[PDB]
Amino acid sequence: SQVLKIRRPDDWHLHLRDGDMLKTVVPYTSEIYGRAIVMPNLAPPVTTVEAAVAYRQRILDAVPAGHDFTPLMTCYLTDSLDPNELERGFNEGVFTAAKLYPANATTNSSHGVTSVDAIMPVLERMEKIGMPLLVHGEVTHADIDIFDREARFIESVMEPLRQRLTALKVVFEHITTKDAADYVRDGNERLAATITPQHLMFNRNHMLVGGVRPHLYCLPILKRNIHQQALRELVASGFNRVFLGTDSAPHARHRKESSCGCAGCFNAPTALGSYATVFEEMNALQHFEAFCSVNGPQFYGLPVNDTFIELVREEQQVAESIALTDDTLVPFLAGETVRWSVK
Amino acid sequence: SQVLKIRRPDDWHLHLRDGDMLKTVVPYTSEIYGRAIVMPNLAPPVTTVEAAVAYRQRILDAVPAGHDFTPLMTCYLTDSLDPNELERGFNEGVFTAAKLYPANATTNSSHGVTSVDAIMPVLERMEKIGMPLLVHGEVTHADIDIFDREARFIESVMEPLRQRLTALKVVFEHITTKDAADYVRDGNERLAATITPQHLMFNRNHMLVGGVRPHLYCLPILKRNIHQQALRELVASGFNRVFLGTDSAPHARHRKESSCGCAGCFNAPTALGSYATVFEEMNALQHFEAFCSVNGPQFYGLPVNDTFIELVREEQQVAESIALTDDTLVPFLAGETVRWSVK
Numbered sequence: 118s119q120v121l122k123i124r125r126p127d128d129w130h131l132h133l134r135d136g137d138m139l140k141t142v143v144p145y146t147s148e149i150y151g152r153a154i155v156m157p158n159l160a161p162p163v164t165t166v167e168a169a170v171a172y173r174q175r176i177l178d179a180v181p182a183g184h185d186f187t188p189l190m191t192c193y194l195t196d197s198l199d200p201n202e203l204e205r206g207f208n209e210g211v212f213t214a215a216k217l218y219p220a221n222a223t224t225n226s227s228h229g230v231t232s233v234d235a236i237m238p239v240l241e242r243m244e245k246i247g248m249p250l251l252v253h254g255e256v257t258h259a260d261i262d263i264f265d266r267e268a269r270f271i272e273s274v275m276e277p278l279r280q281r282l283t284a285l286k287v288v289f290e291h292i293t294t295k296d297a298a299d300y301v302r303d304g305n306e307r308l309a310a311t312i313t314p315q316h317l318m319f320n321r322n323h324m325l326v327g328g329v330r331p332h333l334y335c336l337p338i339l340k341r342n343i344h345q346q347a348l349r350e351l352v353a354s355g356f357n358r359v360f361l362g363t364d365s366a367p368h369a370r371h372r373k374e375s376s377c378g379c380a381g382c383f384n385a386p387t388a389l390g391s392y393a394t395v396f397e398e399m400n401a402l403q404h405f406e407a408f409c410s411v412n413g414p415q416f417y418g419l420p421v422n423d424t425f426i427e428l429v430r431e432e433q434q435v436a437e438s439i440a441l442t443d444d445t446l447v448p449f450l451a452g453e454t455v456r457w458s459v460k
Numbered sequence: 461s462q463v464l465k466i467r468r469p470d471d472w473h474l475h476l477r478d479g480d481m482l483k484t485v486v487p488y489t490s491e492i493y494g495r496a497i498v499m500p501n502l503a504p505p506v507t508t509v510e511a512a513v514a515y516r517q518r519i520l521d522a523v524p525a526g527h528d529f530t531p532l533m534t535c536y537l538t539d540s541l542d543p544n545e546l547e548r549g550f551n552e553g554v555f556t557a558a559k560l561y562p563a564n565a566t567t568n569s570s571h572g573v574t575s576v577d578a579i580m581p582v583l584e585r586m587e588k589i590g591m592p593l594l595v596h597g598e599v600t601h602a603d604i605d606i607f608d609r610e611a612r613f614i615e616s617v618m619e620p621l622r623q624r625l626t627a628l629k630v631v632f633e634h635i636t637t638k639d640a641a642d643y644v645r646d647g648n649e650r651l652a653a654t655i656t657p658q659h660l661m662f663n664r665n666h667m668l669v670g671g672v673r674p675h676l677y678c679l680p681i682l683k684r685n686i687h688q689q690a691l692r693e694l695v696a697s698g699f700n701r702v703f704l705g706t707d708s709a710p711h712a713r714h715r716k717e718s719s720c721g722c723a724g725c726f727n728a729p730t731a732l733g734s735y736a737t738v739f740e741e742m743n744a745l746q747h748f749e750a751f752c753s754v755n756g757p758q759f760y761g762l763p764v765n766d767t768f769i770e771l772v773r774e775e776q777q778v779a780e781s782i783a784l785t786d787d788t789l790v791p792f793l794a795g796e797t798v799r800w801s802v803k
């Protein structure tokens with residue numbers, strides 16, 4: 118019976134893939150979100166204006182008629198990236214931001230950045246022209262326990278970087294730890310963060326107790342419950358430099374369910390309702406709209422969307438699977454009941 | 461190429477399953493080990509002398525001709541277990557030991573234990589007759605992080621138990637933490653432990669960095685590197701109350717590589733050479749035989765084997781899979797080149 122009307126949201130961290138997967142997954146986004154930050158970790162990665170322009174058209178070709186959706190493109194940073202290519206892309210309205218992937222931190226990140234020092238001229242230009250930096254904040258050294266890679270990145274990479282480039286605007290993407298939650302809560306106006314639905318709904322126990330569940334396996338890895346509780350307290354607080362970023366990251370079923378499952382939750386279909394449930398459970402629905410629809414635009418210096426959507430507290434069942442030309446796609450919370458759905 | 465001759469080993473912690481799976485996996489054990497402790501967790505569990513006698517025979521039926529293999533049977537401890545039934549099985553040489561799986565208040569009295577306190581009559585009887593207790597040492601409360609479940613057991617159950625029943629001999633099965641390594645090391649002649657090959661060879665990064673690997677998913681869960689190092693140090697020390705227990709725990713490929721993967725490594729085919737590799741790496745081959753062939757029999761009060769086997773340091777490839785009647789079995793280290801092989 119409970120209806121919840123909000124300003125149309127945006128997704129400030131999205132993986133749309135390419136080809137047949139792209140066709141399949143964009144509508145789950147374009148039917149709800151006004152804009153999306155579309156990450157550049159294709160194979161090969163989007164590291165040029167030309168690439169990004171063509172990719173943006175592939176995205177628009179796949180948007181159903183009558184969806185008013187704008188994909189906001191990113192540059193995949195690399196050690197050798199020409200800062201003139203990054204700036205040109207920004208000035209032509211192609212690149213909204215640039216994305217820092219530490220080499221081998223996640224999917225399609227082997228071409229990622231090997232150090233901050235290797236890309237200083239690029240970072241200094243971003244700082245100059247006011248282009249925000251999106252960070253996948255994990256270290257990747259083989260000796261560092263997977264669950265420590267986020268916290269380690271803060272002391273060793275993030276904090277020194279922000280001390281060097283005091284005017285650089287940085288989004289700490291998909292934060293998963295109390296460490297990151299306090300770092301952002303205590304940061305200045307040039308530091309923001311996104312949080313996915315899964316890192317709010319679940320902790321590592323959900324992925325590993327009673328069976329291993331690859332459909333909850335994603336990066337950065339789900340942490341212990343005290344971390345999850347931090348993140349939930351952060352969004353519930355009303356802190357206005359956190360915003361919605363799904364990190365929807367789809368993989369075919371048998372790439373998830375194999376002897377080496379790919380990391381990624383396909384949560385585009387079910388994310389907004391999942392966020393609503395978290396905010397509802399935290400007695401913080403008065404902060405929901407801002408998380409979804411205002412905080413991101415404010416950080417990015419963009420206008421808020423001028424249309425509205427409704428969520429209804431009526432229990433929908435999530436589909437077991439979504440067809441692809443080859444294999445299926447298992448949505449996040451496949452087969453599950455959800456408390457809130459879009460009207 | 462280098463040869464390691466040892467007295468014929470034994471496996472002090474093994475799962476053989478039943479029916480067709482038993483028929484397939486027995487030979488991997490019976491060709492190498494003289495004896496194995498056969499765990500009782502069938503469906504339904506082995507909780508009677510009658511059941512254990514029939515199970516033993518099904519095992520024996522499946523032992524290839526010429527193999528000198530003796531299965532050592534165990535009783536699954538339950539709330540409803542009659543202490544006279546357990547004592548009769550022990551007296552008759554049917555039950556070598558009794559196995560305690562984690563308590564759970566919602567468990568049917570026919571299938572498990574609600575609390576240790578509720579099975580004191582049985583624990584006091586084992587203590588009286590000198591019957592060893594094998595302990596899966598995890599507390600399974602929903603609110604306890606999975607990586608903490610072993611350490612919490614020590615504090616909450618193991619120590620209080622051993623302080624109550626001071627003559628009870630206890631094997632702390634498949635230890636995975638420094639917490640347990642230290643505990644066992646600082647214990648008395650009545651406390652011992654087994655360690656698996658996977659818990660020596662790997663830590664949780666191997667299961668979760670660069671993909672999720674369900675074939676490394678088993679209980680208790682792989683822990684962070686410091687724990688793996690504590691276990692390696694313990695076996696390498698020559699400490700003589702630790703011994704070989706594979707915890708070989710097979711599941712068909714489709715049950716491992718699903719949306720909810722079963723816990724358990726099928727390591728019977730490769731465990732021995734994997735332990736040899738570990739002792740070599742620790743510069744401790746002088747303690748290899750004792751671990752495999754001496755320590756367990758001493759603790760259990762059984763004769764050391766009088767026949768010998770030989771491992772050779774010749775590189776061999778592990779099969780990618782093993783045929784079942786209806787699926788396949790993916791072995792531990794499938795498709796990998798291993799260092800030590802039986803001659």
Ligand SMILES: O=C1NC(C(=O)O)=C[C@H](C(=O)O)N1
Binds near residue numbers: 222334
């Ligand atoms: O698990 C994932 N998978 C992917 C992907 O692109 O497959 C991206 C994110 C991320 O770390 O940003 N997490």
Ligand SMILES: O=C1NC(C(=O)O)=C[C@H](C(=O)O)N1
Binds near residue numbers: 677725
């Ligand atoms: O991962 C596993 N799976 C099983 C099993 O019986 O499936 C047993 C062991 C254990 O904890 O004893 N570990």
Ligand SMILES: [Zn+2]
Binds near residue numbers: 223253290291336337
């Ligand atoms: Zn990322």
Ligand SMILES: [Zn+2]
Binds near residue numbers: 132364
């Ligand atoms: Zn991402």
Ligand SMILES: [Zn+2]
Binds near residue numbers: 596634680
């Ligand atoms: Zn066990």
Ligand SMILES: [Zn+2]
Binds near residue numbers: 473474475499709
């Ligand atoms: Zn076991």
